[PDB]
Design an enzyme around this catalytic site. Sequence first.
Site, short mmCIF file in Angstrom:
data_model
loop_
_atom_site.label_atom_id
_atom_site.label_comp_id
_atom_site.label_asym_id
_atom_site.label_seq_id
_atom_site.Cartn_x
_atom_site.Cartn_y
_atom_site.Cartn_z
N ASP A 10 61.13 64.59 -13.54
CA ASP A 10 60.65 65.31 -12.18
C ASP A 10 59.67 64.51 -11.42
OD1 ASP A 10 61.81 67.48 -13.56
OD2 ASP A 10 60.31 68.93 -12.92
N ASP A 129 67.10 80.06 -10.73
CA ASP A 129 65.89 80.14 -11.39
C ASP A 129 65.40 81.59 -11.42
OD1 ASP A 129 65.63 77.22 -11.28
OD2 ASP A 129 64.29 77.19 -9.61
#
Length: 243
Positions: A10, A129
Amino acid sequence: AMLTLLPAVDVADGKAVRLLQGEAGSETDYGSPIEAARDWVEAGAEWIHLVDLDAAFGRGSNAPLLERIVGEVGIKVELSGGIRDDASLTRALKAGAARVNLGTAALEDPQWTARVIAEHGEKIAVGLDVRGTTLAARGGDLWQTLDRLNEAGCRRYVVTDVTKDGTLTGPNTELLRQVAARTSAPVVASGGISSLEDIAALARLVPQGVDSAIVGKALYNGNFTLPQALAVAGGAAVQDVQA
């Protein structure tokens, strides 16, 4: 086929980072993203899950850096963050991504999302999510959204329990089982992995349709090495693999 691990990289502000519970501002810096990616290749990864966090938050981008990573590694990359429109999708595919992930777009632009899914097939996954049963946007009801995406022919979901992401509390296996039962598409587990036993538990979900798992904080925190995790994902005993 065994549980497929996708070690994560990330990227925020040009650095490999991990967030806690998906919160912008909660980053821990782990150095160079290209070095992290190279480490995962050298450990025997088949895939990397590569995320542009600045783009995911709609707050800048690291696109050239991610392009360099995708182009340099000879393994498959799942690219996520800011893939919201034709220009960005085109760029991600041209970069050489094996798969992309749509997130906010799947919620905000259902029409575009369905079109993309129809055109690009297995190159497209949707990231869900989840906070409880509500979708978060780095966003709607999980189950309604999932039914719509199934109707649109979505070929793969990435399911993250945002409340567990980065926490080392273990994955939300109940949520994973619930989503996998609701779709014929494979599910990628994300969020909360902490241990080799967590990887073994996820590997026992492959027959239900949870065929993969993204591993972030546990690797960067040194809980286990990627070869250790791959060993367990591929059937080695936790007690043997443990250092």
